[model samples]
Target: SRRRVVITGMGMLSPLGLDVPSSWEGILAGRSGIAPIEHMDLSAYSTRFGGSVKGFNVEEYLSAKEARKLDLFIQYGLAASFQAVRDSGLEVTDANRERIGVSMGSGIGGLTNIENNCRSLFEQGPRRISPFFVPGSIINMVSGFLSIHLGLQGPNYALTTAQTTGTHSIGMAARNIAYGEADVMVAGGSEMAACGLGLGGFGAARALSTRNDEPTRASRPWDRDRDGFVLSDGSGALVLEELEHARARGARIYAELVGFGMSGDAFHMTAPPEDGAGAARCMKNALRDAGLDPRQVDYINAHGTSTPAGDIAEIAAVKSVFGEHAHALSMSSTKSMTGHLLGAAGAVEAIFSVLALRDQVAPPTINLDNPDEGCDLDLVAHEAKPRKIDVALSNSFGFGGTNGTLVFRRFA
Candidate 1:
């Protein structure tokens, strides 16, 4: 029989804060991390705001020289992973190192490094590109470096499934542990794509919010004025261990990761199906995996990216799946505050979901001043609501129409 999986520890670096406690507190306070992009020049871009991770000094976590070989995303991942491992107190002893692993990646890796190298190549010569370019920018290196950094060897894997990367990585890591591939896994995703080209490309596609004037209010999921997702930077990591192994180590359990579901829109590259049947199916799949009825779901950490299409689609999907229970289930989009971390969104939101289960409080979807039609469910608008949660769902749907859902149950 497959073993059960539980998240024993969590670490996060989001626009809200540098670690889990601060981030969770910020969420509960209905704070907004969306602000003017300060890392790069945004004067020429149509959208100038994002959820930037402020005041993070990599030197605090990594040696100065060690930090140079890695891009911001990898650094963020390492910071988060180290915090998670420490929080978990799961020492990676040689006897169990081989039975441990890392599953992580970035939706887009090393954008700053890539852009700098490419610019150097063109401005000076091909040889002007830094030698560390490839090593620092590849998506898989996040997992590779994590394995070496922490001595995990069972399965080192990476996924670049766009926004679904974090959720998929964590889910796949749990699956590996459940199927006996490993006993523990450090899994999550990271992103630091707020570069000139990064922002330019996304802005050119009109994929980011253009509410540059009011940066903080830009990411308004389900709001009538929502423009698009605000790109953010950071990482989220979790220590997933087999329940027995965790018990053996006396690990503190955050929540049981009971369900994972995947689906595809098979529609457009950036938009979900009009009726959101794909998302509905994904949630249904997760509920079935959890062996729970809709009534059991008390909260949802929505994938609401503050876009017109995405929010409506998700709302429709929720209504379709939960029906009568949809009216009662509390759902909120933390993206309203954290903006969209892109690849890291799932992992960040997953931690939020686990925290919801831990704290029994549903965070708010701030700036829901005026909701659109079909957005009338208990969206937990503008204020955090204290509630006893039975089951919480975290949704992440990405480009290429890939969809992933994670269901966590309160520890009984």
Candidate 2:
């Protein structure tokens, strides 16, 4: 039998709020965090609204001097990881330091920093750039900075599979614990892509909602009137530990990380197969890994990104796997409130799923008044639903046709 892996702590930085408590609270209350893009002037851009993390003050978590050395994305990761470490109450002493690790990722890292530095080079010449430019703006620095801050010294890695980055990182961290390579791992993903380049690039791809007039209704996943995803920014982190290690330390277990599965859709570069065969296979693999039948899952936190092709594809994929059970189980996309955090979406939603098991309340899919053709499944729409959940699944499918599924069972 494999070693049991469980989540002992969770932390978040998102549009809903800066940390887990506030963010989860906002989600339960059905409040939309998306709003007009205030990170930078967007008058020139096509889409003007986004799920920006409001009032983020880095001094709360890091020194002003240290904060300046890292990009916002790295700062977000460090902040979330600090919260997870504190929540877990795991001390990184010499005895256990070597057995702790970090696995953090970002779909696109340090976009703001890169853009600023490049502009500096073009206008002010090479000498005008900061010496810490590369370290502050690189993709792997999220993990690098986290390891230094936390003093973890076991297997470290970063993922960049677009939006799948978060769930994939969490799943990978749990695997490290299951493999006995580490007793504890800090894992998640972060994104701070609200800059000029970030919005402009995605806008060019036609991935963002152009609902500049109705920001609240912009991210209406599974709604017939939904247009596209609203860009959001944030980070999420989880403290995963081996069951025996956690038990020995008297740690609190939030949920058991019982199943993780991954698959690739060789069919398309930016879209899943219209039938969602790849997505169905991914969830089926996760259910099989958990040794649970389809009927056992009571809730699902979907990857419903509010995209036309993506939402219907996910619903159809879900129906393919759950069949009659799909209608019976409650599924939701907290993205309805949080917007699409891209890499951070999966991790944040995964935490929400674990919270659902703990609270026995399914978070709602806000603004989903009129369901789309294939989205007739029970979506826990508009408000939080009171229901007991024994097992919950979170899905994250990225732009590259990469997919990840994580199954969390209520800890007995």
The TM-score values for the models, in the order shown, are: 0.99, 0.99
Candidate 2 local lDDT, 153-230, one digit each (tens): 888888888989999999988888898889999999999999888889999999889999999999999999998899
Candidate 1's C-alpha lDDT? 0.91
| Residue 151 lDDT (model 1) | 76
lDDT against the true structure, per candidate, is 0.91, 0.91
Q: Where does candidate 2 clash, by residue pair?
A: none
Q: In model 1, how large is the Cα lDDT of residue 362?
A: 94
Q: Per-residue alpha-carbon lDDT of model 1 for 207-233, expressed as tens digits?
A: 988888899899899999888899999
Superposing every Cα of model 1 onto the true structure, what RMSD results?
A: 0.9
Model 2 misplaced stretches (Cα beyond 4 Å): none
TM-score, cand. 1:
0.99
